[PDB]
Amino acid sequence: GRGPGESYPDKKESQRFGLYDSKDVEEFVYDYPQENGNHTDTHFLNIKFEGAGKLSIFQKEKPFNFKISDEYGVDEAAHACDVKRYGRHYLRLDHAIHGVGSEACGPAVLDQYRLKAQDFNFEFDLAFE
Amino acid sequence: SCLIPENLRNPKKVHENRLPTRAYYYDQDIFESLNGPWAFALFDAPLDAPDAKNLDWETAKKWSTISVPSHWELQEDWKYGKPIYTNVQYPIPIDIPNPPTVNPTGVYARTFELDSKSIESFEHRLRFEGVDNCYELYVNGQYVGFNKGSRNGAEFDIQKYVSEGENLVVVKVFKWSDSTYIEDQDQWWLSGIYRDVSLLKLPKKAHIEDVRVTTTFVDSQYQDAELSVKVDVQGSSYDHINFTLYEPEDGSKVYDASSLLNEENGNTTFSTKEFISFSTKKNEETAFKINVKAPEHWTAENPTLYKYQLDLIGSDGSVIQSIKHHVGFRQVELKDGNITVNGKDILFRGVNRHDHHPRFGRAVPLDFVVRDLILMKKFNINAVRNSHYPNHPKVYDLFDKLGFWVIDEADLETHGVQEPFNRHTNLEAEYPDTKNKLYDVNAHYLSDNPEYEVAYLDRASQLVLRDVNHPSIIIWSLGNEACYGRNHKAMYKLIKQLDPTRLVHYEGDLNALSADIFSFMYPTFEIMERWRKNHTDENGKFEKPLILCEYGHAMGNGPGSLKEYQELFYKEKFYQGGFIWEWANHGIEFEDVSTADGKLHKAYAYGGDFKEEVHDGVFIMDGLCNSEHNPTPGLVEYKKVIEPVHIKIAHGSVTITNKHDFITTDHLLFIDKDTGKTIDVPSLKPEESVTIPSDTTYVVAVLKDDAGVLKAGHEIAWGQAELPLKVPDFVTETAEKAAKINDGKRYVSVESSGLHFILDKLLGKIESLKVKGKEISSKFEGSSITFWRPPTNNDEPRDFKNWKKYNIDLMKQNIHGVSVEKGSNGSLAVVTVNSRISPVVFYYGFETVQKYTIFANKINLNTSMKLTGEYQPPDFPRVGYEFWLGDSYESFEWLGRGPGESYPDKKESQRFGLYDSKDVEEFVYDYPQENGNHTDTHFLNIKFEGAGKLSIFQKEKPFNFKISDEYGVDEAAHACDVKRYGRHYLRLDHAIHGVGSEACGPAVLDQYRLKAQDFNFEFDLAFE
């Protein structure tokens, strides 16, 4: 999918398609903790488990969104060092995500990038090697 | 300690309510299998397990099931844990006699049906063939008893407890107990009901409980013998016993897995070729002694058996119970200082065999055990040691029928008491002649601990009384590596009282104060020889002989020098052979993640793979056969060194010597391989020989007819005349061809019709050598001459440490001068390269001269290597060139040793001949290491598609070579971790280090070590 860095509906085109390895990427730390680390237009995702190979994950007929991390208490952490961390990782596996825009000072997320309220229908496969 | 149940920490609680041990006989009419799915639940410790006095079947019905027999660490998805491998160290803390408080407890439950007639007609028992570590037994919510001794059997009387209809059996199995301390064999820790469970239905009013059969020769010429049959009948309602001995079936009898394992049957007429009949009289002793006229001897080389039928008979003259078994006429003695069978001082051609299966562990299907023994017979083995416990009871008929000298061994090992001592004193080495003083220090914990006497005696009593009637068993062993103490003396007294007919072995007893035999493990020849001399008096008499209960450690590439051990065996009557360690690798099949692939592959696990806190790594993989129980080059070599016929070809003569203990050569067909016609060889008795004039080079000894489990045409022995090194008749093109020589700043070119030679002068590297469509180039990393090999298991403890310490893996070639001159005597050009080959960090290295004399169809490579500098290594792994083969490469062919690999001290089984790489399945080691070398190679032809062959030969001496695909061998944990290039290479070697057995045993012997020295050798690269 898109990489090596994060990508969002209206902030993704610099992140070209390719095969990416989490080991090759320094994930970006925001000076003010907030939504980060999503990967949009993901074709498939392989999660490697020690001594047991991979779990492959893919969404049917459309690319998906994902985030793999450690972190929580992000909403209320004032600075990077205030971010809390679990004793294990999680996968945030997403059908869709709201765009990013520039509304702090400027236009709202444009229409075509907004995650409008609607029915959701999506199929995932959890394929184990 | 009230958090540990009393029976799991009482050395004296060997059992509760177990019946006395009796001779084992399987009877289809009496035995009813309770194998299959059982309700099963696993608990953290005894205190979490339910009270079995209150466990309903209605409750247990709801549990998951496990299949009996099986270990609970070997289930689908590792549901109840994984195997643990320790060698010496205990996997628990030492606090004798306490087990750990957290003690995995498995509760088994199942039901069985009982008839109205059944309870009236029969005595009901439960027989458990093996349960690890110990268990209490319940029937219909009532405690029956308790038992310890994992590899021993147990019977319990069940009559009081059984009801008409459904009956509930509940077994509580515990992983650890005070018994753990004496069950410390170098093997996998595995738990559960891993052997058969049976319901026995014996005739109620009277039945046969036990039988003793002995055969003693009446005479010093071993002709007439006394057959003694003593029967223990239980109950009043019988008249007498009948006994029928049948005419013998010769040991050459043909068997297969099906006929060996056939268990039938009730209406089956055992035999009808009557030989002797005896009847007892009413109210008289149910025993007798018979004189037997010159019976056929039972021997491991010829396992001749007399079938017999013993009948218990009632008042109405009807048959109450029958035993159908066999008699083997054989007598073992200690005679004039030797282990003697039928007067003959025998030679052990042996192995240690553990119970192991790569998927089922110690729960080995009989089918698989048969497989083992057929393979043993196919490879000239004549003896097995039951390391280190009795096997499944049905196995011993297999030994009886196929013919093996058997050491049946008590389930008793104490090794772990030494580990803290070894570490605290920083002990580096143990030697067979002195190590007993180290074990003496800790004997008081167990083997010299009075609290354990009952346990130790029980292991002896159980060992002997179950298996007393098998002619194949000639020696009882008191256990293994358990130190030496009073308990061993007690075991010896008991075994001699129980069974005076056999001899007693115990290696932990150096001076055999309570053994009949001396025994060493992994001894040096010097140590063997010291012992021999100190135990042979001035007259030449010895009181007891020496065997090697363990020797020639078969771990990985090896063992080296089996030859030298064998020469010693044949030279001295005092030595009576040995049992190599071990039969097969203990690998457990599992899914591995590949280091080469990143993908999941089938592999064979050793210590560490199941993530044990403490383990002993790759020492699991120490067999002549791999984890799948298939032959390695170890087994192939062993078969040759122990071959029971010697065939020596020299000076127009074939000398054949019979090296059997008993049998003649009559069963053997001798073929002159050079002509295909057979050779008339006179019938040779043991030790007899014959010289026959012949022009032959190669003679084979082969089986005339199917006999035992061997097929007609099976090779038993062979010999070859030594083969002089002949220079191939290759015609070097010495005609004058115009050749363009381009000596550039860095690169030197030599071009001629059909020839292209490019050398990098900076590196000493051949960039490309293409002659007549055939291309090679140097496989270059630092040096054009390399020295490293992926360390074998034997290399690891010492030689590897040295080679790494001296940076032999980082040897560099530093070019000093390159000389380029026009061709002289038919030559196109001469390129001479002067360099120092030396590793980083170090002074030592070789002042090297490489002279490339280039002809149109040949390249002569002269190598001169002068060893210079201070602080040198003692030896090298290897020395030679590495070449990439061109894309055209398809296969190879060689004149030399084959078809398999060969090494300086592991080569003689690989006879000389012309071999084709296409005919050979190259051996894959369970643990990746040095492999695939071919020693004593006369010439090597490398075939390139569409361009013929490149012939390679070394001047005046045979050479070594390996052609492969592989790398990352040093660090690959399993076969699937081995990486592969997109092209093949040739490893072309002047010399190679021997292999030895140093992982556990002697270092590579002097004459096989690749000592640090000057190297001078010349190769020709001849292009067709």
Ligand SMILES: [Mn+3]
């Ligand atoms: Mn802060």
Ligand SMILES: [Mn+3]
């Ligand atoms: Mn691996």
